[PDB]
């Protein structure tokens, strides 16, 4: 059949089985779960998800999902999208930047990865207790990426912006 | 000054600098980005983000974020929450399950980990071409009895008669 893809976003007060019903409703709808991201932020359950199924099954998910969010104070958001081309990743680079000035610094580092077409998976930019600003980014690069070269360019940027930054590589 | 926390979630067509916009709007509003999850699913930019700031700044972001979205065809959702008890995990457990049946197999494994208070970071449950595979990346702190976890997990797979494995990775 014509396999259709859908993107799901959900936020709800984290409780024992909230994530059960979600994958329950999705899998029990005939759809496949291509990938997802689950994070516990604050007292909240946050989920990013990409599913695929027949046009019939997806609609089934597009209809039933909001109801689940009604009886659980859950908040949903969906959006159909083109199929997902699997980008296998060979490494996870973890970056850590520290500065005393936060002025437009974070977007300099996200741009660093965009210019190189490296997708980030997580980020944090914040002022710590006690007058410094710390940025933390996690990104995935494939096997075709020159690691020693990525590290050098990252060091140059850090020199250019006069901040302290470290880079870490982790393969899976 | 009475720190407020805001969970933000967005999904729009993946374009360049789209993420930059979000980070710019939030940081210029004087807020901190405590954590976030970014992913490119299909052809969409996907974001989960937890920010915090004073009520004035959070209100500012709550006010101007939707607008930014209207600009970049980005649909967003927001909700305030309580302080973040930032947990650290001693191990990352990669789980892999291979079966020749789809029927209610997924809930079994999520329940398995929810019941044991072991959080999941990612999940994929799909058929591959007549075998339904489940990949789960979960977090396990140091107070976990790895021997018991292994045994119970093996008993799960045995009861469902599927093939499962766990790979303990140190963070």
From TrEMBL, chain A:
Top-rank taxon: Bacteria
Compartment list: Cytoplasm
Main location: cytoplasm
Record's keyword annotation contains Transcription: yes
Keyword terms, alphabetized: Cytoplasm, Repressor, Transcription
GO cellular component: cytosol
Stored InterPro entries: ACT-like_dom_sf, GcvR, UPF0237/GcvR_regulator
Tagged with keyword Transcription: yes
One GO term (biological process): regulation of DNA-templated transcription
Name of the protein in its database record: Glycine cleavage system transcriptional repressor
């Amino acid at each position: 059949s014509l396999t259709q893809h859908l993107v799901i976003t959900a936020v709800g007060t984290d409780r024992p089985g909230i994530c059960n019903e979600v994958v329950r409703l999705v899998t029990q709808a005939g759809c496949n779960i291509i990938d997802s991201r689950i994070a516990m932020f604050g007292k909240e359950f946050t989920l990013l998800m990409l599913i695929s199924g027949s046009p019939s099954n997806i609609t089934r998910v597009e209809t039933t999902l909001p109801l689940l969010g009604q009886q659980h104070d859950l908040i949903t958001m969906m959006k159909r999208t083109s199929p997902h081309d699997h980008q296998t990743h060979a490494y996870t680079v973890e970056v850590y930047v520290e500065s005393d000035d936060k002025l437009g610094l974070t977007e300099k580092f996200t741009q660093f990865f965009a210019q190189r077409q490296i997708g980030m998976a997580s980020l944090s930019a914040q002022t710590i207790s006690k007058n410094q600003f710390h940025i933390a980014i996690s990104a995935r690069v494939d096997s075709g990426c020159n690691l020693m070269q990525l590290q050098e360019e990252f060091d140059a940027l850090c020199t250019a912006l006069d901040v302290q930054g470290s880079l870490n590589f982790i393969k899976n």
